[PDB]
């Protein structure tokens with residue numbers, strides 16, 4: 001699809017068999033989701049946002065569907081104002097910016 | 100142009116006669132630039148994101164040339180870690196997400 005930016009680019013994602021709403025964020029290098037359960041082991045990661053740095057849990061090779069496109073990659077879990085799909089997964093779904 | 104997401108979507112902007120580098124951020128509702136002087140009246144605002152909030156100055160009706168395209172709108176100025184072009188100006192240049 002072609003998504004305009006008059007409103008927030010919120011889409012449905014599917015992870016762990018559940019639907020969630022998430023923001024397509026070209027300013028984010030990584031994908032960060034609000035508190036949830038994911039399988040396997042996690043590693044520590046510090047991420048910097050507009051307000052400062054936060055600790056998150058890094059899970060690798062996680063299956064996630066974004067706006068109907070399947071991806072398998074790194075998902076960070078932590079305190080975020082909204083679920084964000086960052087460039088690591090936007091590249092997997094073939095997303096570009098155009099003007 | 101078609102801007103890839105393999106790297107951060109950084110472009111050249113021109114504002115107040117100054118050339119700067121800025122991030123095209125579909126996850127940002129607003130445009131926020133690192134500390135600089137702008138003409139006219141301003142009012143304070145708090146903007147939130149990962150890590151919390153930052154206090155910024157809000158200037159309205161500001162002219163910005165983004166990657167050669169003129170856009171007018173509100174520009175926030177404060178302690179952001181990177182210059183961000185948010186949706187309020189991305190819409191003006193006809194920027195869309197495509198996949």
Ligand SMILES: COC(=O)N[C@H](C(=O)Nc1ccccc1CC[C@@H]1CN[C@H](COC(=O)NCc2ccccc2)CO1)C(c1ccccc1)c1ccccc1
Pocket residue numbers: 008023025027028029030031032047048049050080081082084086124126127128129130131146147148149183185
């Ligand atoms: C009242 O309205 C808001 O509070 N709006 C928020 C917003 O637009 N706020 C905002 C406005 C102007 C400039 C910068 C920012 C802050 C948001 C931008 C988003 N992209 C980059 C995200 O990049 C980072 O956080 N840095 C690195 C990183 C790496 C991996 C994963 C995430 C982030 C930089 O921050 C918004 C939002 C909040 C609640 C519900 C829906 C949306 C939001 C918050 C946090 C993340 C994404 C969006």
Ligand SMILES: [Cl-]
Pocket residue numbers: 072073074088089
């Ligand atoms: Cl990844």
Ligand SMILES: [Cl-]
Pocket residue numbers: 171172173187188
């Ligand atoms: Cl505006």
Ligand SMILES: [Cl-]
Pocket residue numbers: 004193
């Ligand atoms: Cl349009």
